[PDB]
Design a binder for this molecule. Structure first.
Ligand SMILES: *[C@@H]1O[C@H](CO)[C@@H](O)[C@H](O)[C@H]1NC(C)=O
Ligand SMILES: *[C@@H]1O[C@H](CO)[C@@H](O)[C@H](O)[C@H]1NC(C)=O
Ligand SMILES: *[C@@H]1O[C@H](CO)[C@@H](O)[C@H](O)[C@H]1NC(C)=O
Ligand SMILES: *[C@@H]1O[C@H](CO)[C@@H](O)[C@H](O)[C@H]1NC(C)=O
Ligand SMILES: *[C@@H]1O[C@H](CO)[C@@H](O)[C@H](O)[C@H]1NC(C)=O
Ligand SMILES: *[C@@H]1O[C@H](CO)[C@@H](O)[C@H](O)[C@H]1NC(C)=O
Ligand SMILES: *[C@@H]1O[C@H](CO)[C@@H](O)[C@H](O)[C@H]1NC(C)=O
Ligand SMILES: *[C@@H]1O[C@H](CO)[C@@H](O)[C@H](O)[C@H]1NC(C)=O
Lengths: 99, 442, 197, 208
């Protein structure tokens, strides 16, 4: 097929390239702990008033949305502009966990 | 300052002034001929596209440029093997040097194979190997890509990473070295007779007598001062070693060839980082950022840029390969006429009258040790164009008429050795009338 | 990102330096981000594939050379499955020879040396050698007849050098060789508008 | 019989043909254009819109033609190197005898005959190649009357009992006289010097 013939002759012919595909996936990030305050806010001694909603600065830390679950069942988890579970794959200049 | 064109010598011309050299030196010069640049293969998909499938699909739609480029590179590579075969494989049989390596004093030890070191390369070959920057040889290191190391000189590893593949020479460095050994063994033992068919043994003093006779120098000189020739030869070989090791400009030609190949490859690699007007220069990032429907334009532009870079690389490789092939035809001619024989073309096998030549394999080329004869210590004499005797003009058969100041001698034209003038070195043609400058003598 | 083999590194990464780069801007060395270890990134084993064959009218058996890779550790995965022994996980037996050029699969190594017919790479040459070692059919040996061997650079002649020995040729042949020199390629004219437009 | 005997000229013809075929296939390559037919491009999109596509196709075809012309220049430089080689072979091998080693055929070139072939020349390099070599004992000079003699034209060999000066490329022994050897020096410096006898052609005329 390479020689476009049916009577190929004696010799060595470069046909293709030998490749070895990878077989595993290794995704690793350097073990950052940097606990964002989410649980400590939600069970504080006293919250802030709704009209005077406290602007909690959520930055310089790593988010752990997996703990947003295991709260009271059928709690509203609406999200506007982005899915709640995909937030792990998104980065933000700032986050506000206004409560 | 104004360029000094040299010592403004005043050639002491006269109607009868001549200079005949009384002394000489055995100049073992050195000519470095690149013979075969490193053969290379460019996996079109792996270089231009890497592992990206969409890029390969788009490249196939573009046409058969990859096929033409691969055929051109394969032609270059088989041409490099052909260059080695024409330059080196000039004989069918392989000749082993005799154990008694005595040749009248011509110490070939630094050019003959070294049984002590395992490489069996000659010490001069070892110097040439060390001075020139090395190259990959596909060492079995169980690294997946033959040779490799951890946080070290991985430029060859990087080149294999990028898709450019330096295929090994067909004749290994040891096998190229053994072909060079066969050539040098035939030259030392057979002489010039192994390039015309069967190899015919002849001692080295006799071959050197032939080399003397082939440059208009009578062969008796090689034997009357045989020890002087041997000592000059050996000391010149030592000076060759000293100059090659000390002066870094000694191996300039082959080192420049290797550097040209390396910088061509480096420019190729940097083309991968060049944008050519694309949003970036990494195919994987382009694909992961933009889907193929919108990344198509950017990847197409990058493909065109890298294809142009590869095509320019292949064309300049063809140009420099024609240059290497011209130098390789020159090297084959120099082996046929200087190594496999004696070339009387002036300044072809080194400045001076070329005596003989010795091939020494160097990385991707050959060092010719052009043993030439160079005169020196000339003496001035009054000369004549003919010699009148008995009314007829005698002319020299082979030499030249010179005069001490009171005696006339017919001497060889390139080495002062006075001889009486008789009927055997001179012949009669005409009468002493039309010969202006004719000189009475006996 | 990268594709390759992560191996333990003998090189110590500076307290703040991130990941190794070579001279030609390549992600070669590395330090483990999660924990304080160092690794090296090795390119995957991809090389090439070449096909060594005699005349098709002479044989339908074959040999395959993988250039660059080494027979010992080469990940020869399932390339193509068919009745032929090549492109499988392993060959049918001892016909897997390791040379500097690469891995020759389907051809049996020979300790003897003949002239080079099909250059494989790094001094090893192949040949479809019809032999009676299998003691089978004359025109078809039992296994694949493709063998590899060290290239016999020729008959290892020993010019009998002696301080007094010479050779003179008694006879000769008026050889008539034949050298073909291309002189003038077909002169061509391209009407630019007719071709391009 | 052997199809590779005319390998070079047939290869040149095939190179020409394959370059032409590559040029033809360039009219089939899209080069990124919407198609690879000028008429289809003109008929599908209006010139204000088809201008970009036709410019892309023109650039692709022009670059392919430029590559063709440049590789024609390169292989024409190769052809011209081989053509100056052929002119020199005609001048020194055909119009004369060349003493350049292995220039007009392996062995000692005798003469050459031009034979025109399609787009090239065939030189029937009639060369002289020796064979059936006989071994002898040699000596770099001959000591007679206490002075050295060196061969004018030949080389000294010996079948075992007698020394003969022979032509250096065809075994033809001849006796040694003063007409084939010349005196140079004496027998104290030269190594390998051997005692022998060298005949004087003038001797019989001394009878009277
Ligand atoms: C010799 O000297 C010069 C150079 O040839 C010339 O002018 C002069 O006439 C010559 N005389 C004779 C006798 O050769
Ligand atoms: C000829 O030149 C060499 C230079 O190496 C010198 O050693 C030698 O003495 C010279 N010959 C004579 C007779 O002086
Ligand atoms: C040279 O010899 C001739 C006779 O052949 C004689 O006539 C002449 O005087 C001599 N001297 C010169 C200077 O010609
Ligand atoms: C020139 O050489 C001859 C040779 O015997 C000698 O007799 C003569 O004295 C020398 N003359 C000069 C000036 O060198
Ligand atoms: C040549 O013969 C032997 C062996 O090659 C060597 O050792 C010796 O020096 C030489 N003798 C003569 C007379 O050439
Ligand atoms: C020389 O060789 C030829 C073979 O080409 C042979 O026919 C001829 O008889 C030989 N000459 C002699 C004198 O044996
Ligand atoms: C050779 O001849 C010389 C005299 O011509 C004589 O003295 C000598 O003994 C002979 N033999 C050798 C080996 O020189
Ligand atoms: C050597 O050649 C001479 C020359 O006539 C001859 O008489 C003699 O028999 C030859 N001997 C051998 C051994 O060839």
């Amino acid at each position: 097929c390479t020689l476009k013939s049916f009577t190929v002759e004696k010799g060595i012919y470069q046909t293709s390239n030998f490749r070895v595909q990878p077989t595993e996936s290794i995704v690793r990030f350097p073990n950052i702990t940097n606990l964002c305050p989410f649980d400590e806010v939600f069970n504080a001694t006293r919250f802030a008033s709704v009209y005077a909603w406290n602007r909690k600065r959520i930055s310089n830390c790593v988010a752990d949305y997996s703990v947003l679950y295991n709260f009271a069942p059928f709690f509203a988890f609406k999200c506007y502009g982005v899915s709640p579970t995909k937030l792990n794959d998104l980065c933000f200049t700032n986050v506000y966990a206004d409560s | 300052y104004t360029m000094s064109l040299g010592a403004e010598n005043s050639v002491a011309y006269s109607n009868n002034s001549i200079a005949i050299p009384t002394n000489f030196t055995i100049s073992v010069t050195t000519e470095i001929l690149p013979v075969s640049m490193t053969k290379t293969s460019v996996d079109c998909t792996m270089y231009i596209c890497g592992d990206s499938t969409e890029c390969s699909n788009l490249l196939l739609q573009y046409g058969s440029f990859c096929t033409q480029l691969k055929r051109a590179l394969t032609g270059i590579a088989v041409e490099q093997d052909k260059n080695t075969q024409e330059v080196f494989a000039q004989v069918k049989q392989i000749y082993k040097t005799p154990p008694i390596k005595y040749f009248g004093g011509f110490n070939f030890s630094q050019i003959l194979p070294d049984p002590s070191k395992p490489s069996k390369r000659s010490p001069i070959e070892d110097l040439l190997f060390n001075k020139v920057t090395l190259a990959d040889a596909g060492f079995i290191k169980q690294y997946g890509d033959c040779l490799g190391d951890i946080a070290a000189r991985d430029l060859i590893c990087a080149q294999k990473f990028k898709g450019l593949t330096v295929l090994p020479p067909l004749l290994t460095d040891e096998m190229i070295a053994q072909y060079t050994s066969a050539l040098l063994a035939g030259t030392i033992t057979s002489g010039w007779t192994f390039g015309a068919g069967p190899a015919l043994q002849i001692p080295f003093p006799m071959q050197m007598a032939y080399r003397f006779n082939g440059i208009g120098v009578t062969q008796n000189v090689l034997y009357e001062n045989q020890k002087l020739i041997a000592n000059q030869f050996n000391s010149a070989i030592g000076k060759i070693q000293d100059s090659l090791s000390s002066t870094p400009s000694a191996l300039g030609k082959l080192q420049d060839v290797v550097n040209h190949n390396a910088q061509a490859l480096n420019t190729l690699v940097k083309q991968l980082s060049s944008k050519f007007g694309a949003i970036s220069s990494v195919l994987n990032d382009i694909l992961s950022r933009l889907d193929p429907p919108e990344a198509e334009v950017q990847i197409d532009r990058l493909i065109t840029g890298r294809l142009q870079s590869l095509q320019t690389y292949v064309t300049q490789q063809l140009i420099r390969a024609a240059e290497i092939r011209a130098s390789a035809n020159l090297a084959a001619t120099k082996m046929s006429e200087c190594v496999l024989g004696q070339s009387k073309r002036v300044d072809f096998c080194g400045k001076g009258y070329h005596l003989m030549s010795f091939p020494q394999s160097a990385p991707h080329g050959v060092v010719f040790l052009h043993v030439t004869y160079v005169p020196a210590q000339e003496k001035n004499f009054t000369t004549a164009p003919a010699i009148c005797h008995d009314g007829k003009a005698h002319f020299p058969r082979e030499g030249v008429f010179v005069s001490n100041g009171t005696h006339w001698f017919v001497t060889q034209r390139n080495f002062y050795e006075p001889q009486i003038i008789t009927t055997d070195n001179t012949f009669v043609s005409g009468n002493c009338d039309v010969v202006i400058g004719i000189v009475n003598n006996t | 990102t990268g594709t390759g083999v992560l191996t333990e590194s003998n090189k110590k990464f500076l307290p703040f330096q991130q990941f190794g780069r070579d001279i030609a801007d390549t992600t070669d060395a590395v330090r483990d981000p999660q924990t304080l270890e160092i690794l090296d990134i090795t390119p995957c084993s991809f090389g090439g594939v070449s096909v060594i064959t005699p005349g098709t009218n002479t044989s339908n058996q074959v040999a395959v050379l993988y250039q660059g890779v080494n027979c010992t550790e080469v990940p020869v995965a399932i390339h193509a499955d068919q009745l032929t022994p090549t492109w499988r996980v392993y060959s049918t037996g001892s016909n897997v020879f390791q040379t500097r050029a690469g891995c020759l699969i389907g051809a049996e190594y020979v300790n003897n040396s003949y002239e080079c017919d099909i250059p494989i790479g790094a001094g090893i040459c192949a040949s479809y050698q019809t032999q009676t070692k299998s003691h089978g059919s004359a025109s078809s040996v039992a296994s694949q007849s493709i063998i590899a061997y060290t290239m016999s650079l020729g008959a290892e002649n020993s010019v009998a050098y002696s301080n007094n020995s010479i050779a003179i040729p008694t006879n000769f042949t008026i050889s008539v060789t034949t050298e073909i020199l291309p002189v003038s390629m077909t002169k061509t004219s391209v009407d630019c508008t007719m071709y391009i437009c | 019989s052997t199809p590779s005997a005319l390998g070079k000229l047939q290869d040149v013809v095939n190179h020409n043909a394959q370059a032409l075929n590559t040029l033809v296939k360039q009219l089939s390559s899209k080069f990124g254009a919407i198609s690879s037919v000028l008429n289809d491009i003109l008929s599908r999109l209006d010139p204000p819109e088809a201008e970009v596509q036709i410019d892309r196709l023109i650039t692709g075809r022009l670059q392919s033609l430029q590559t063709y012309v440049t590789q024609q220049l390169i292989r024409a430089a190769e052809i011209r190197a081989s053509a100056n080689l052929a002119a020199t072979k005609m001048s020194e091998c055909v119009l004369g005898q060349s003493k350049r080693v292995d220039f007009c055929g392996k062995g000692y070139h005798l003469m050459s005959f031009p034979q025109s072939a399609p787009h090239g020349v065939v030189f029937l390099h009639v060369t002289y190649v020796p064979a059936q070599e006989k071994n002898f004992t040699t000596a770099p000079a001959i000591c007679h009357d206490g002075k050295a003699h060196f061969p004018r034209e030949g080389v000294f060999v010996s079948n075992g009992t007698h020394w003969f000066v022979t032509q250096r490329n065809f075994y033809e022994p001849q006796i040694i006289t003063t007409d084939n050897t010349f005196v140079s020096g004496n027998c104290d410096v030269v190594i390998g010097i051997v005692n022998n006898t060298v005949y004087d052609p003038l001797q019989p005329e001394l009878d009277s």
